[PDB]
Every structure is written in C-alpha cells, then in structure tokens.
Amino acid sequence: PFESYNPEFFLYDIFLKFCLKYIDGEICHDLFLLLGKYNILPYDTSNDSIYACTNIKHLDFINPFGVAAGFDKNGVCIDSILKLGFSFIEIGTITPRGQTGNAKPRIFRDVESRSIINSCGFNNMGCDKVTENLILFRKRQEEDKLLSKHIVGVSIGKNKDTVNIVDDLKYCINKIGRYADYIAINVSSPNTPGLRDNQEAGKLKNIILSVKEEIDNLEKNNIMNDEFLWFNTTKKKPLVFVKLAPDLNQEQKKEIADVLLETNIDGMIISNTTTQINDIKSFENKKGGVSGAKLKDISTKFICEMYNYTNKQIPIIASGGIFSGLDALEKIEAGASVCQLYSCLVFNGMKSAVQIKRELNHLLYQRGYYNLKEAIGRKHS
Numbered sequence: 001p002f003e004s005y006n007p008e009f010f011l012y013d014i015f016l017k018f019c020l021k022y023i024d025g026e027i028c029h030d031l032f033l034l035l036g037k038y039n040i041l042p043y044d045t046s047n048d049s050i051y052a053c054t055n056i057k058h059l060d061f062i063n064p065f066g067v068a069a070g071f072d073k074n075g076v077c078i079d080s081i082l083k084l085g086f087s088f089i090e091i092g093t094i095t096p097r098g099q100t101g102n103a104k105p106r107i108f109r110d111v112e113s114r115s116i117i118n119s120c121g122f123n124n125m126g127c128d129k130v131t132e133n134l135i136l137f138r139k140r141q142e143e144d145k146l147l148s149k150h151i152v153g154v155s156i157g158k159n160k161d162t163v164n165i166v167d168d169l170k171y172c173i174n175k176i177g178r179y180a181d182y183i184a185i186n187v188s189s190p191n192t193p194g195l196r197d198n199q200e201a202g203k204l205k206n207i208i209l210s211v212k213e214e215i216d217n218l219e220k221n222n223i224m225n226d227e228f229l230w231f232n233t234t235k236k237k238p239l240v241f242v243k244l245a246p247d248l249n250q251e252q253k254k255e256i257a258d259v260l261l262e263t264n265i266d267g268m269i270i271s272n273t274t275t276q277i278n279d280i281k282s283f284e285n286k287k288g289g290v291s292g293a294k295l296k297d298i299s300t301k302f303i304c305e306m307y308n309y310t311n312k313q314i315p316i317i318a319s320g321g322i323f324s325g326l327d328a329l330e331k332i333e334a335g336a337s338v339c340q341l342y343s344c345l346v347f348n349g350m351k352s353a354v355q356i357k358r359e360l361n362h363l364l365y366q367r368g369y370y371n372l373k374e375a376i377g378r379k380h381s
C-alpha cells in the first residue's frame, strides 16, 4: 500500500472510520464525490485476472464488481469511481425532470451492523443534465484507451408526480439511451409512492415491452445518420434490465419470472433495499429501505428463487450485502453473473474493489474453479 494514490494506503482507513463515527452521512458522501470530481481519489493500478471476467450477452465485464445505482446519481464522477477498480457503474436513478427528493434527514447508517436505511426519493438533476454529464464521460473515454472497456448503465425511473410511468421511461430512453450500455428499469424503490405496484405482472409486461420498443425505435429512426448512434462502450443498443424489490410473496415472484421469460428481458438486478428488517435499534421509527449486511441473506435467497423460476434463462446482477469475496461467491454460486456494491463502499471505503477482487481470486483458486463463469449457478444441482 505505497504512496497516496494506492486505494489501500493506510491513511484512508483512518480517515474513513473517523468519518463513520463523527461525520454526517450526507457530508461523507458529498466529500467522496468532491474528491472524485477533482480526480483525487486513489486508483487501482492492478490488471485484473482474466479468469474472473464475466459477461451478460455482449457486455464483457473486465472484472465482476460494479457500483450500484444511487451512488453517483448524476454521473458526476464516473471516471474516478471506476478507477478505484470497478468494471462498471450504474448511474441514476434519473427522472425526466430534476427533483430534490424527500425531506431530510433521510440517510442513517449503523456501523455495527454494516447497514444503511434511506428514504431519499430519487434526488437527481434530471435526465437532460445527467445526459450531459454522461456525454462528457463518453468523450473522455473516446480518448483514454484505459477506460475503453469499462461499462456504464443508466437506471431510469419516474418523477414523483407522474401518473403513467411509461411516459417518463420513454422520455429517458429518447435522451440518454444512445449513451448507455444498458438501461435499468427501476420499479422497486421503496421511497416513491406507488412505484413498487408496477411489479405486478400485467403492468410490468407493458413496461418492459414499451421500453424495448422505444429503444428499437431509436435505432430504426437514426440508423442512417452521419453520426453513429451508439456512443457507448458496446457500440450497440442498450440491454434492458429490471431491478426488483425483495418484498414480494412467492406468487408475485413466479408471475414476474413468467413475464421476464415472455418479454425476453436481458437481465434482472436482484435486489433493491428491503422494508422487512425490524431488528436494528438505530433504525427504530425510521422510514425507508435497508441496505447492507442485513440484506445479504434475503437478497441471496431471492437470487436462488428467481434463477429457478426463470429456469436459468435470465442473467442475474447481484445487489445486497456484498462486502467480501466469500459474499461475492455466494451470490455467483446462487446464480449471479456479476455483483454490484454500495454499502461496501460506505463501510470499507477506497480499498473496496482492490480487496474484494483479491479475496474472490484466492477463493476461486481454493475451490478449484478454472474461472468465475464455471461457478455461476453452481449451488443448483
């Protein structure tokens, strides 16, 4: 861990736990984003093992760890976050018009249980301004050969007061879609009234098909233009993922799986935050969704259920409680092709990607796997 740029340089751990103990979470997160905006975060100088690469269709992840949605909501420090050692980032969730979200305080951390609860409310600058931030990343990427394989997806949602979610989803596709490697459809935030109701099978089917049709029309209507349409990493139209909430009964889970099979979604993000956790004293009488270690078992079990309900035909992006290489292998053996981190960055900080990639690599050795892909879904059978 040699010199200031190394993500494991000893000072970052001391700065981090001082922050966790004494500094409001909103301030800590703004500080992290400030360091990133001015490109003074440490960066991972390692070249990733080829034996831990993974793919979802034509998306070739250089390593299996990305940053989950809601961390860089406005796409203002994509480069710096990726250079910590992540292979991709999901920016968003964005909405057509900007919004400041719900009233504060709305973030609360519990270091002891490595857990967060939040009622943020899709605070973002709006689709149009976030699109400009992503365009600036894409121009830098075009000229920095070292970012040319990193992936950026965009999570899209609805403004709090919109009546038909589909209008807002189409609006985002038509402005930011051409710059995205994939689109994550967010029907699972706990903090926008009515949003989770769109996980009902009938509504969800119409949402998926409208989104895919809007993406396919983007292509049709611009194939012939002098500027190439897909200004992203893949140079292809974005894949479509759905992000699911873990607070569903089994019948809802089965009915959603049937819809995902029929609509040919490209992947599912399992899962968003949970409202079911009642046993954290810090968070008593607090509203919102719980992230972190106490979401791990819940979301891993959800991965197993959905891998089997979709008969292993729908690739899985794992989110929830991932801090260690063992955590990550649990998600992968459960059915996931790739992992997203959020809480790990809050409680482990700058070394998050370095550490968990090293832990996973050693673990793939100790368990005799030739590569990560061999481990996907191996819990089953």
Ligand SMILES: Cc1cc2nc3c(=O)[nH]c(=O)nc-3n(C[C@H](O)[C@H](O)[C@H](O)COP(=O)(O)O)c2cc1C
Residues within 6 Å of the ligand: 068, 069, 070, 071, 092, 093, 107, 116, 118, 120, 122, 155, 186, 243, 271, 272, 273, 290, 291, 292, 293, 295, 319, 320, 321, 322, 340, 341, 342, 343, 344
């Ligand atoms: C403060 C905060 C804001 C979040 N915002 C979003 C969001 O805008 N869109 C989304 O899909 N998920 C959002 N999430 C959910 C995370 O992306 C992730 O799915 C969840 O926190 C579980 O992962 P973790 O246990 O590693 O933290 C947010 C989570 C937190 C803690």
Ligand SMILES: Cc1c(Cc2ccc(C(F)(F)F)nc2)c[nH]c1C(=O)N[C@H](C)c1cc(C(N)=O)[nH]n1
Residues within 6 Å of the ligand: 012, 015, 016, 019, 020, 024, 025, 026, 028, 029, 031, 032, 035, 070, 071, 107, 109, 116, 120, 345, 346, 347, 349, 350
């Ligand atoms: C601890 C932490 C870190 C790690 C870190 C920060 C500062 C430093 C420093 F030493 F260099 F300064 N090092 C490491 C990043 N983020 C948080 C955080 O607690 N975030 C809260 C939960 C939040 C608020 C919102 C919101 N409005 O979205 N979203 N998450």
Ligand SMILES: O=C(O)c1cc(=O)[nH]c(=O)[nH]1
Residues within 6 Å of the ligand: 070, 093, 118, 119, 120, 121, 122, 123, 186, 188, 189, 190, 191, 192, 272, 273, 289
């Ligand atoms: O912005 C938010 O409130 C939010 C969205 C989401 O999808 N998940 C979450 O935990 N918070």
